[PDB]
């Protein structure tokens, strides 16, 4: 019995450990979020299937690691769901072929927010899984330890809802002018959703975001967001109604807005936060 990965390493007869670097594509689902499906990443086979049956379990103590180690969730093993981190060993999966076949493990995360996320840097540890292998022939009892790493920079969603993008950059026409902001949100199941903006503002109305450009800044102008013409102040919750599986645009537009005094030539930049809430 031996196992291999989709990203070029393996563990031979007798077990051992390996570092698995996975290109993550997490997704929200109803009541739990997929962090990683390893059934495309880890494959195992039986070396003498005519005369030996191999038994494979997920061993207790399998858990999230690194920046995810505080999170709990569930693990789907061979079609059934168990609490994760694992407090008890799963039932057995039988391997009875020389053909390498999936280790059927998928890790999920219990939602904690509306639409927030954890930003994961490429190369970060996300989980440690213990594959236990026995057979019906001798007393072999081996551990195949899979250390799961993010291969890519990614955001793991922690909410019931997810967004088309986490980091949006738009370019205004030269002053004066406006530009639409592409940003949509959807939820695994229908949710009553709102959002509010965050940032530093220049005006007594708390609605013109300061020009924080670092090189050759203009003076006298900031950035103001509107929704169909209505100004959005900071820390003022806008309702999106009921948001379901179809993506809903926030309908945001960026504008220049004067902050007082002489307007001078130069660059303009504002960084604005968007945060979702359940209503």
């Amino acid at each position: 019995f031996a196992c291999k990965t989709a990203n070029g390493t393996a563990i031979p007869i007798g077990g051992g450990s390996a570092n698995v670097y996975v290109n993550l594509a997490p997704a929200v689902n109803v009541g739990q979020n997929l962090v990683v499906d390893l059934s495309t990443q880890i494959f195992c086979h039986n070396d003498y299937p005519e005369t030996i049956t191999d038994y494979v379990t997920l061993q207790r103590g399998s858990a999230y690691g690194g920046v995810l180690s505080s999170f709990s969730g569930t693990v789907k093993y061979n079609g059934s769901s168990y609490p994760f981190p694992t407090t008890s060993e799963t039932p057995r999966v039988v391997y009875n072929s020389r053909t390498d076949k999936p280790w059927p493990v998928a890790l999920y995360l219990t939602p904690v927010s509306s639409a927030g996320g954890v930003a994961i840097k490429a190369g970060s540890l996300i989980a440690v899984l213990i594959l236990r292998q026995t057979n019906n022939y001798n007393s072999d009892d081996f551990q195949f330890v899979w250390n799961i790493y993010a291969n890519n920079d990614v955001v793991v969603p922690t909410g019931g809802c997810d967004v088309s993008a986490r980091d949006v950059t738009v370019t205004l026409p030269d002053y004066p002018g406006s530009v639409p902001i592409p940003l949509t949100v959807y939820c695994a199941k229908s949710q009553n959703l709102g959002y509010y903006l965050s940032g530093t503002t220049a005006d007594a109305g708390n609605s013109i975001f300061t020009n924080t450009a670092s090189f050759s800044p203009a003076q006298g102008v900031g950035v103001q967001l509107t929704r169909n013409g209505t100004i959005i102040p900071a820390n003022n919750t806008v309702s999106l109604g009921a948001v379901g599986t179809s993506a809903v645009s926030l309908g945001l537009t960026a504008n220049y807005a004067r902050t007082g005094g002489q307007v001078t030539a130069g660059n303009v930049q504002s960084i604005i936060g968007v945060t979702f809430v359940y209503q």
Partner: peptide, 13 residues
């Protein structure tokens, strides 16, 4: 915050 919007612009004399 959940999402960050970076708005870039320019004032020309």
């Amino acid at each position: 915050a959940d999402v960050t919007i970076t708005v870039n612009g320019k004032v020309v004399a």
